[PDB]
Amino acid sequence: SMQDPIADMLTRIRNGQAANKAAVTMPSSKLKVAIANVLKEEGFIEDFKVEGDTKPELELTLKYFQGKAVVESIQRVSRPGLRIYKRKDELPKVMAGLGIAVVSTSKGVMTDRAARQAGLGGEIICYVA
Amino acid sequence: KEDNIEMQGTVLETLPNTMFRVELENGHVVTAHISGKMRKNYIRILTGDKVTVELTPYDLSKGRIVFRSR
Amino acid sequence: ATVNQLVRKPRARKVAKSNVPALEACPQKRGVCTRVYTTTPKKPNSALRKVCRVRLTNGFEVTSYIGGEGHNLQEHSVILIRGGRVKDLPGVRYHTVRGALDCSGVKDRKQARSKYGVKRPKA
RNA sequence: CUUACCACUUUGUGAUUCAUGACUGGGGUGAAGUCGUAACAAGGUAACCGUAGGGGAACCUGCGGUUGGAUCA
RNA sequence: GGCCGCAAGGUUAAAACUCAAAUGAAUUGACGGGGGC
RNA sequence: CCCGCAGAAGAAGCACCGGCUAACUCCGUGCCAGCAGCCGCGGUAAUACGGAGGGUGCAAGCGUUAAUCGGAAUUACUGGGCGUAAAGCGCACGCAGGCGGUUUGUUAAGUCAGAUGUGAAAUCCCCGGGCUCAACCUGGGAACUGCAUCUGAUACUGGCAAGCUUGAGUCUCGUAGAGGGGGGUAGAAUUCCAGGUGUAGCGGUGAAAUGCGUAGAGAUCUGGAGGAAUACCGGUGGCGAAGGCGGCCCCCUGGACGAAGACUGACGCUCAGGUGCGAAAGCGUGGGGAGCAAACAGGAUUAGAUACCCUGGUAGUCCACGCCG
RNA sequence: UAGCUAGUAGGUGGGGUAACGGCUCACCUAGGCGACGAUCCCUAGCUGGUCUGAGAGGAUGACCAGCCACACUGGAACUGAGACACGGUCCAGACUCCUACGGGAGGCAGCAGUGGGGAAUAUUGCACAAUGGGCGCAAGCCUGAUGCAGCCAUGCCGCGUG
Numbered sequence: 001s002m003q004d005p006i007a008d009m010l011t012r013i014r015n016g017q018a019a020n021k022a023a024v025t026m027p028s029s030k031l032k033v034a035i036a037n038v039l040k041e042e043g044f045i046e047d048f049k050v051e052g053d054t055k056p057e058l059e060l061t062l063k064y065f066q067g068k069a070v071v072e073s074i075q076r077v078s079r080p081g082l083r084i085y086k087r088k089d090e091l092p093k094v095m096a097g098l099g100i101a102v103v104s105t106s107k108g109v110m111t112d113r114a115a116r117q118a119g120l121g122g123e124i125i126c127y128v129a
Numbered sequence: 130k131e132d133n134i135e136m137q138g139t140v141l142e143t144l145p146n147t148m149f150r151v152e153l154e155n156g157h158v159v160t161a162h163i164s165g166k167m168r169k170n171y172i173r174i175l176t177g178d179k180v181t182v183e184l185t186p187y188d189l190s191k192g193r194i195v196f197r198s199r
Numbered sequence: 200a201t202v203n204q205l206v207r208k209p210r211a212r213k214v215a216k217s218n219v220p221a222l223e224a225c226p227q228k229r230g231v232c233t234r235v236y237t238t239t240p241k242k243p244n245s246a247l248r249k250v251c252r253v254r255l256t257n258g259f260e261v262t263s264y265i266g267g268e269g270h271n272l273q274e275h276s277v278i279l280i281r282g283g284r285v286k287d288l289p290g291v292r293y294h295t296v297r298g299a300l301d302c303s304g305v306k307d308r309k310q311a312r313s314k315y316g317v318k319r320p321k322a
Numbered sequence: 323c324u325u326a327c328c329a330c331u332u333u334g335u336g337a338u339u340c341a342u343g344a345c346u347g348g349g350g351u352g353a354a355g356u357c358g359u360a361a362c363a364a365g366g367u368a369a370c371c372g373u374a375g376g377g378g379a380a381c382c383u384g385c386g387g388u389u390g391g392a393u394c395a
Numbered sequence: 396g397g398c399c400g401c402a403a404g405g406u407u408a409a410a411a412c413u414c415a416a417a418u419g420a421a422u423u424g425a426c427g428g429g430g431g432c
Numbered sequence: 433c434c435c436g437c438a439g440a441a442g443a444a445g446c447a448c449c450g451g452c453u454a455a456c457u458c459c460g461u462g463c464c465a466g467c468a469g470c471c472g473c474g475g476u477a478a479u480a481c482g483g484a485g486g487g488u489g490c491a492a493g494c495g496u497u498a499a500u501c502g503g504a505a506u507u508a509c510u511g512g513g514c515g516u517a518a519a520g521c522g523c524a525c526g527c528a529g530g531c532g533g534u535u536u537g538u539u540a541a542g543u544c545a546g547a548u549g550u551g552a553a554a555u556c557c558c559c560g561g562g563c564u565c566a567a568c569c570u571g572g573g574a575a576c577u578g579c580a581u582c583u584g585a586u587a588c589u590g591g592c593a594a595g596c597u598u599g600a601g602u603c604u605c606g607u608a609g610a611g612g613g614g615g616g617u618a619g620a621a622u623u624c625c626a627g628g629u630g631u632a633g634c635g636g637u638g639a640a641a642u643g644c645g646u647a648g649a650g651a652u653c654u655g656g657a658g659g660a661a662u663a664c665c666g667g668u669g670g671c672g673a674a675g676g677c678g679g680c681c682c683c684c685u686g687g688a689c690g691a692a693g694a695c696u697g698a699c700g701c702u703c704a705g706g707u708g709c710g711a712a713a714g715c716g717u718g719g720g721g722a723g724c725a726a727a728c729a730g731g732a733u734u735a736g737a738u739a740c741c742c743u744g745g746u747a748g749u750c751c752a753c754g755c756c757g
Numbered sequence: 758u759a760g761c762u763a764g765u766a767g768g769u770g771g772g773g774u775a776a777c778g779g780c781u782c783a784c785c786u787a788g789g790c791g792a793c794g795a796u797c798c799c800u801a802g803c804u805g806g807u808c809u810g811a812g813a814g815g816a817u818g819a820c821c822a823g824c825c826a827c828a829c830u831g832g833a834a835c836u837g838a839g840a841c842a843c844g845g846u847c848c849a850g851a852c853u854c855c856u857a858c859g860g861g862a863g864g865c866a867g868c869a870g871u872g873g874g875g876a877a878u879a880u881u882g883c884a885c886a887a888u889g890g891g892c893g894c895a896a897g898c899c900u901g902a903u904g905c906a907g908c909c910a911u912g913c914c915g916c917g918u919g
C-alpha cells in the first residue's frame with residue numbers, strides 16, 4: 001500500500017523533471033507543504049499551490065534554466081524502514097554545500113545551514129542537489 | 130646425473146599416461162616414462178621391444194627410456 | 200538483504216583455511232624420513248624429482264621436497280621441515296631445511312649459500 | 323556412646339565420547355590401458371526434466387512436461 | 396542426525412580432498428548425413 | 433666524564449639481476465641436472481639451471497618459514513546481488529512479527545539543547561624540559577565518541593481521545609466464461625460375436641520374415657455386446673491461486689467485470705513457524721478392460737545390436753476410497 | 758540442542774548470618790523460565806590497552822596497571838579485625854623417600870637450578886647503599902620485594918670500520 005507519502009512526493013518531482021513537465025500534482029499534506037515551501041525558498045521550484053477543501057491537491061511548478069532541470073538529484077533519508085537523526089555537531093553537508101538537506105527541528109522544517117545556525121539537531125528528511 | 134647408471138631392458142606391458150613396465154637385464158622390473166625427443170619425434174613404443182634404460186641410484190624401481198630397438 | 204533480515208541473521212565471515220596443516224602454526228617441525236624416493240612431475244614439465252616421506256613429532260605423515268643438487272638422507276634420518284609447496288608435484292606441501300640436523304648442506308655451492316646451509320669458503 | 327548431612331569407593335544400569343579396528347562402500351587425480359560412440363550440426367532415433375522397468379559400460383523403452391530444437395523442402 | 400512415508404523415497408544439509416579455473420553474451424573463420432540462388 | 437700514548441693502525445656481509453620489480457654478458461649444460469610467489473623456464477648461441485666477471489638493493493645485518501590485518505566493494509552498516517553467469521519457495525491462506533492514509537487536542541517514551549557527576553594511572557595526540565642527539569624519561573593540555581540524573585524544546589515517530597473519506601469492505605441492477613462437484617444422454621470410429629454373399633489370400637517392410645486364412649479369412653451387408661475419447665466449430669479465444677479446464681441437457685456451487693446510487697469509517701500491505709491445494713509415474717483394497725503399451729516372447733539389422741524396425745503382449749492407462757508430495 | 762524446572766516460583770511461622778534473602782526447616786498456594794533463544798553441548802580468565810585500516814570495522818589480551826580464580830587431587834573446619842589460609846591444621850587418594858617393617862616424612866604455578874617436552878626462551882651472582890614493607894621507645898634485625906650485575910643482534914636507537 002501507500003506507506004511513505006514524502007518519498008512519493010520526491011519521486012513525482014524527479015520523474016516530472018526527467019519528463020520535462022511544467023508541473024506535477026499530488027494529494028496535499030501539511031508536512032508536504034512545509035517541505036515544498038523550504039524547497040521553493042531555496043530556488044529549486046518556481047511556486048507551489050493548494051486547492052480544494054474536501055480533498056486538497058498540492059501543485060508544484062518545476063523550473064528549467066538551460067532546458068535542463070534545476071533539480072538534478074533527490075534522495076530520501078530517514079525512510080520508514082530506517083529512521084535517521086543527527087545532532088548539531090553532525091548535520092551533514094550535501095555537494096560540499098552547494099546543495100541543501102531538509103531537517104525537521106523542534107522549531108519546524110529547515111535546511112541544515114539554518115539548523116546548525118539555530119544550534120539544533122533533528123531528522124534528515126532528504127538530500128537535494 | 131653424476132655417476133649415471135646405464136642399462137637395457139624389455140618392455141612387457143602398456144600402461145596409461147604413456148608409462149611402461151620393463152623387465153631389466155638383471156631380473157628386476159621397473160616403471161619407465163618417455164623422454165622428450167622420442168616424444169617430440171612421435172616415436173611410439175609397443176610391447177616386446179628391447180629398450181635402453183637410464184637409472185638413478187636414488188631409486189631403482191623407476192627409470193626413463195632413451196632408445197628403442199625400432 | 201533488508202535491514203530486518205540482517206537484524207534477524209547477521210552477515211557471516213568467510214572461514215579461512217591453512218594450506219600447511221601439519222605444521223600446526225609452528226614455523227618448523229622435526230620428523231624422521233621413513234622413506235626416500237623420487238617421483239615425476241605433471242604434464243607441461245618432465246624430470247625425475249627427489250622426495251621423502253616423514254613422520255612428524257606431532258603424529259602426522261607428510262611428503263616433503265629435498266631441494267638442491269644431491270642429498271644424503273636415509274630411511275631413518277632426522278630432518279627439519281618448513282612450509283612451501285612444489286607446484287608440479289601433486290600433494291607435496293613442505294620443504295626440507297638443508298644443513299640442519301642430519302640433512303647436510305649442498306656441496307660446493309657458491310651462490311645463495313645461506314639457502315643451502317653452506318659455510319663461507321675460506322680463502 | 324549414638325543419629326543426621328557427606329567426599330571417596332564398590333557393585334549393577336544407562337547414557338555419552340575418544341582411540342583404534344576385522345571388514346565393506348563410494349569419491350578425486352591421470353600425456354600413447356581395454357570396449358564402445360552416448361553428447362556437440364537435424365551429432366545421423368532432437369535434446370533435456372520427474373518417474374518406473376531393463377542392460378558390460380557409456381544407455382534403451384513406457385507416461386507426462388519444456389524449447390535451453392533444425393526444416394517447413 | 397532429526398522429521399514425514401505401507402514402500403519407493405521426500406525434506407532439512409556438511410566436511411576432508413582437488414584444480415586454477417568453471418561460466419554468460421557476443422565477434423571472425425572452419426564444419427553439418429542444415430537451407431536457398 | 434676528562435687527559436695522555438701508538439699506529440691505519442684492532443673492525444663488512446646477505447640477497448637478487450626474463451615480466452610484476454631496481455640491475456646483463458661469457459662459459460658449462462642439453463625438457464637432463466635443476467629453478468619456481470604467479471605468468472613459466474630447460475631437448476645445442478639459455479639475460480630463467482650451475483660457475484665466473486659486472487650491476488642493483490639493504491648493511492651489523494641480510495634472507496626463508498610461521499601468524500594477523502590490508503589490497504578483497506570477496507559477507508557489501510558506511511559499501512554487492514537474484515530473466516540467461518551462483519541466487520524468486522510449485523501455488524495459496526494465515527498467527528507472532530515488520531510497516532501504515534488524513535485532521536485536531538493532549539502526553540513527553542524515542543528525538544534535540546543546556547547543566548551536574550563520572551569515564552583510575554599508564555598508553556595515544558599536542559606543546560615544553562633532561563640525558564652530547566636519538567631510543568628513553570618527564571611537566572601541562574587535549575581526548576576517552578560511553579553511562580547516569582536534573583531542567584527545557586514539541587517539527588517527526590510512539591501512546592491516549594475524538595473526527596474524516598481518498599485505501600479497504602457491504603447492498604441494488606446487469607454481462608461473459610472448456611471454473612468446480614453429481615446424474616443422465618447422443619453421434620462417429622477400433623475390437624469381439626451371430627447371420628447372408630463370397631473365394632482364396634491378407635498383413636508387414638528399405639527388403640523381408642514372424643503372424644492369420646477352407647474350421648470359410650481378408651472384402652461387403654444386417655443385428656447384438658463392451659470400453660474409452662469428443663470430427664467441424666477451434667481462434668491469432670476464454671476461465672482458474674497454481675496444477676489445469678473442450679459433445680449435449682439438468683441439479684448444487686465459487687470467482688471476476690461494468691453503470692448509478694446508498695451504507696461502514698482505515699476496518700490496510702506483507703509474513704518465519706503453521707495449514708491446505710498440487711501434472712505424470714508409483715503404492716494399498718475392490719471393480720472394469722475396446723484401443724493402446726514398460727517388462728517379456730518371436731522375426732529382422734549389424735561384427736556385435738540386451739536398440740531404433742515388424743508380429744504379439746502383461747502391469748498401467750479407466751472407476752470408488754486412502755497414500756505419495 | 759525446543760522445551761525446562763518440585764526448594765522448583767511465591768506466602769505464613771520458627772531457626773541462622775556482621776547483614777537482606779529458600780539462606781535453612783514445617784505448613785499452604787501451583788507457580789516460575791523459553792523463540793527478545795530458556796535448557797543442553799563445545800570453547801574461553803575479564804578490562805585499560807595492543808596490531809591493522811582513511812574509516813567503519815577485523816584480529817588480539819605477551820610486557821606494565823586494575824579485577825577475578827587456583828596453590829599435588831577431593832572433602833572440612835579452627836584461629837583471627839581479616840583465611841575456610843602458596844612456604845598452617847584434620848581426613849581421603851596417587852606418587853616419592855626412610856625404617857628396627859612397628860610405623861613415619863613431603864608438595865618450586867617464590868628466586869637460582871635439574872630431568873622431560875619442544876622449532877625455541879638466561880646465573881644454583883652482589884647488596885640491603887636507594888624506595889617500600891614487618892617487628893621495635895630507639896639502636897637495630899629481617900626482606901630472591903626492590904636496586905644492580907651476568908648470558909642472548911630478540912627488538913628499537915646512535916656510532917665506527919678512516
Ligand SMILES: NC(=O)OC[C@@H](O)C[C@H](NC(=O)[C@H]1NCCC[C@H]1O)C(=O)N[C@@H](Cc1c[nH]cn1)C(=O)N[C@H](C(=O)O)[C@H](O)c1c[nH]c(Cl)n1
Pocket residue numbers: 367638733734737740741
Ligand atoms: N550395426 C547396425 O546397427 O546396423 C547398421 C545400421 O547402419 C543400419 C541402418 N539402420 C538405421 O538407420 C535405423 N534407423 C531407424 C530405423 C531403423 C533403422 O533403419 C540402416 O542402414 N538402415 C537402412 C536400411 C538397412 C540396410 N540394412 C539394414 N538396414 C535405412 O533404410 N535407413 C533409413 C534412412 O536412411 O533414413 C531409415 O533408418 C529407415 C526407414 N525405414 C527403415 Cl526400416 N529405416
Ligand SMILES: [K+]
Pocket residue numbers: none
Ligand atoms: K458518516
Ligand SMILES: [Mg+2]
Pocket residue numbers: 365
Ligand atoms: Mg551419435
Ligand SMILES: [Mg+2]
Pocket residue numbers: 376
Ligand atoms: Mg531382463
Ligand SMILES: [Mg+2]
Pocket residue numbers: none
Ligand atoms: Mg554463445
Ligand SMILES: [Mg+2]
Pocket residue numbers: 437438
Ligand atoms: Mg695516539
Ligand SMILES: [Mg+2]
Pocket residue numbers: none
Ligand atoms: Mg689507506
Ligand SMILES: [Mg+2]
Pocket residue numbers: none
Ligand atoms: Mg627492470
Ligand SMILES: [Mg+2]
Pocket residue numbers: none
Ligand atoms: Mg635462483
Ligand SMILES: [Mg+2]
Pocket residue numbers: none
Ligand atoms: Mg644465469
Ligand SMILES: [Mg+2]
Pocket residue numbers: 467468480
Ligand atoms: Mg626464476
Ligand SMILES: [Mg+2]
Pocket residue numbers: none
Ligand atoms: Mg658473481
Ligand SMILES: [Mg+2]
Pocket residue numbers: 504
Ligand atoms: Mg573488506
Ligand SMILES: [Mg+2]
Pocket residue numbers: 512513
Ligand atoms: Mg557479486
Ligand SMILES: [Mg+2]
Pocket residue numbers: none
Ligand atoms: Mg546454464
Ligand SMILES: [Mg+2]
Pocket residue numbers: none
Ligand atoms: Mg542460473
